[PDB]
Nucleic acid binder design. Structure first.
Lengths: 68, 49, 57, 241, 119
RNA sequence: GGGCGAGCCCCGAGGGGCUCUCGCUUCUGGCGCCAAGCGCCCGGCCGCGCGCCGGCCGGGCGCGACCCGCUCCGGGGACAG
RNA sequence: CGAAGGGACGGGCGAUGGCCUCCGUUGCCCUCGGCCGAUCGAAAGGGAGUCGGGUUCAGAUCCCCGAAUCCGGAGUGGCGG
């Protein structure tokens, strides 16, 4: 299926397609709060490999952590 | 104003949008008296205060 | 009297039967009548001299 | 008569220092909330930055009038609806022993909706036409599929909105729509739309994949640059020419 | 056609519903543990309180600490069907509350005090 | 657009291109908001009856208050940090 | 670095309540709207309105007697002017 390509696309983080996406997302999440709920996963295949299933009750959050 | 060596001039403007009088805290120039009209803007003329 | 005693006082005891009564001294209220009137007459004077400027030039 | 001379005009002068301002529209200067302000300038960042052609390819969307016939032909092939699975299941339930039938005959062709279903049958050359929604808010789900359908020779089209693409299926969103099989009388109707899509997406593929987008400044800034261009033109166009 | 008159965005007045519980939280309401018998403990046989009876036309009681002048007035009405002009309370320096209930002049204090049992 | 506008050139003294100026406030310790007017529609009562006819009562919309846009305006900005 | 109002006048729709004539109740819609932010913080700061006499072994501007005064309510307005 498409889950294999999404995995291997995300491994080319230095590639210019991913640098545009990482730039837009990190700009977007910086304007939000330090802790808020996300409705759907940004990375679906990575969530499923760690045990996330798209059914009722599976909740995800997003937390900003200071660098250093 | 206590703790300050300069007097303050209480200038009241009318808000050009909604019907109220707006009170300001202007530092008084030397020569400012009560009831003197004080202008504020780009087209205002050139005098003290 | 104390300001919270003003509730039980009558209307005529709290003001004076006049325009701007009970909150404006009689010296300055009649001066505002003759202040506002002379501006309105001067504004008529200015707009007449403004009107001749439109017609002549 | 009808008129009465007690009706004067008494107009209001809306000047500076004159009579007070009226209640005019102020939509430009509303202090919008954080979520409204974020998403409004987020679309601006999609016009400021140099978006890559793999993402810029979803700005070139199929035009208006051809999208109607794509949906009209897909309207008769939509997946079947809740309680009509049970209508289909119950109708074939009596037929086991009512009229001497095991129901082995045929399942009518339908569309495909998920990305995992479409990509499996595009690699295996079982697809004839792929419809792709452009407004998926992870774009990473569908980026290779425009590129993958070109090599496999499967025609691919980009459509406005996952909502109306999610209306062909009986759900909210649907990123991908792939035609595997159609009926005989609709094969000629599908074929006239296949060649029109190939000449826009597949045949000119070299143009899209090196087509960067963005680099469009604001109208307040573009007009300032355009003011400098016409001022430079005004300075030296008549001295020599 | 709808314009934004104010430059400040304000949260719209959304509709909120009331409570339609599918089951009461507590099974039954609690019974009143401050009834007309738990509010009047016992009167006083003090000669200082005795002198107050035929002179001031009053009665003296020990009253529960969580009481109220409205409830004490209604309590003596409920028990011994006597009307009250005013009720007067204090808290003694021993933990409890004492009440000086004043009767209306149409009844006699020492006549009803014999019905109480105190004399 | 609009004009008292400073005017020039062409000019038929109606008027078109060019630089700039305002969306029309400086003499006085007064007032100023919750629109006038215009235009187009709607409902009820009465009389003409051919009714977009007239009278009364009660409402809506647009101009008045130009149109379109993508950052609220500015000041920095690849440096600050 | 904030979608920080749950309030109010008038009108329209519908309903119940008491002699659904009238008044009253609540839900929605149109409309208006800020004010600088929850809250706590003085028994010497602000803060409406009680005094005289008598009375107890020990309390009295607090109890009794006699004179007032302030606040809130009133639908049918309880009466007059």
């Amino acid at each position: 299926g498409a889950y294999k390509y999404i995995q291997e696309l995300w491994r080319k983080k230095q590639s210019d397609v991913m640098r545009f996406l990482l730039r837009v997302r990190c700009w977007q999440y910086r304007q939000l709060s330090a802790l808020h709920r996300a409705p759907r996963p940004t990375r679906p295949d990575k969530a499923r490999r760690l045990g996330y299933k798209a059914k009722q009750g599976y909740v995800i959050y997003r937390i900003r952590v200071r660098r250093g | 104003d206590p703790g300050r060596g300069a007097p303050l001039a209480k200038v009241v403007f009318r808000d050009p949008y909604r019907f109220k009088k707006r009170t300001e805290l202007f530092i008084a120039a030397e020569g400012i008296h009560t009831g003197q009209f004080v202008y504020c803007g780009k087209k205002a003329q050139l005098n003290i205060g | 009297v104390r300001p919270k005693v003003l509730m039980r006082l009558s209307k005529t005891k709290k003001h004076v039967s006049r325009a701007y009564g009970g909150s404006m001294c009689a010296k300055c209220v009649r001066d505002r009548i003759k202040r506002a009137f002379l501006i309105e007459e001067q504004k008529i004077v200015v707009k007449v001299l403004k009107a001749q400027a439109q017609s002549q030039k | 008569k009808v008129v009465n001379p007690l009706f004067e005009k008494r107009p209001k002068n809306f000047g500076i220092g004159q009579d007070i301002q009226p209640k005019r529209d102020l939509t430009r200067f509303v202090k919008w909330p954080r979520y409204i302000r974020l998403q409004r300038q987020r679309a601006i960042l999609y016009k400021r930055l140099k978006v890559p052609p793999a993402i810029n390819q979803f700005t070139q969307v199929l035009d208006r009038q051809t999208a109607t016939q794509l949906l009209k032909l897909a309207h008769k092939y939509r997946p079947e609806t809740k309680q009509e699975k049970k209508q289909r299941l119950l109708a074939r339930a009596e037929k086991k022993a009512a009229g001497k039938g095991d129901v082995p005959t045929k399942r009518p062709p339908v569309l495909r909706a998920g990305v995992n279903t479409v990509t499996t049958l595009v690699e295996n050359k079982k697809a004839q036409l792929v419809v792709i929604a452009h407004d998926v808010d992870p774009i990473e789900l569908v980026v290779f599929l425009p590129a993958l359908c070109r090599k496999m020779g499967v025609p691919y089209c980009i459509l406005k909105g996952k909502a109306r693409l999610g209306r062909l299926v009986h759900r909210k969103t649907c990123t991908t729509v792939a035609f595997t099989q159609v009926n005989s009388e609709d094969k000629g109707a599908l074929a006239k739309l296949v060649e029109a899509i190939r000449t826009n997406y597949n045949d000119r593929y070299d143009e899209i994949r090196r087509h960067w987008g963005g680099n469009v400044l604001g109208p307040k800034s573009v007009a300032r640059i355009a003011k400098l261009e016409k001022a430079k033109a005004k300075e030296l166009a008549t001295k020599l020419g | 056609k709808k314009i934004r008159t104010s430059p400040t965005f304000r949260r719209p007045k959304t509709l909120r519903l009331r409570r339609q519980p599918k089951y009461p939280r507590k099974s039954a309401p609690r019974r009143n543990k401050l009834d007309h018998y738990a509010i009047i403990k016992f009167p006083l046989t003090t000669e200082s309180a005795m002198k107050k009876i035929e002179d001031n036309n009053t009665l003296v009681f020990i009253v529960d600490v969580k009481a109220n002048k409205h409830q004490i007035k209604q309590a003596v009405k409920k028990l011994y069907d006597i009307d009250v002009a005013k009720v007067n309370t204090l808290i003694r320096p021993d933990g409890e509350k004492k009440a000086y209930v004043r009767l209306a002049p149409d009844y006699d204090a020492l006549d009803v005090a014999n019905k109480i049992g105190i004399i």
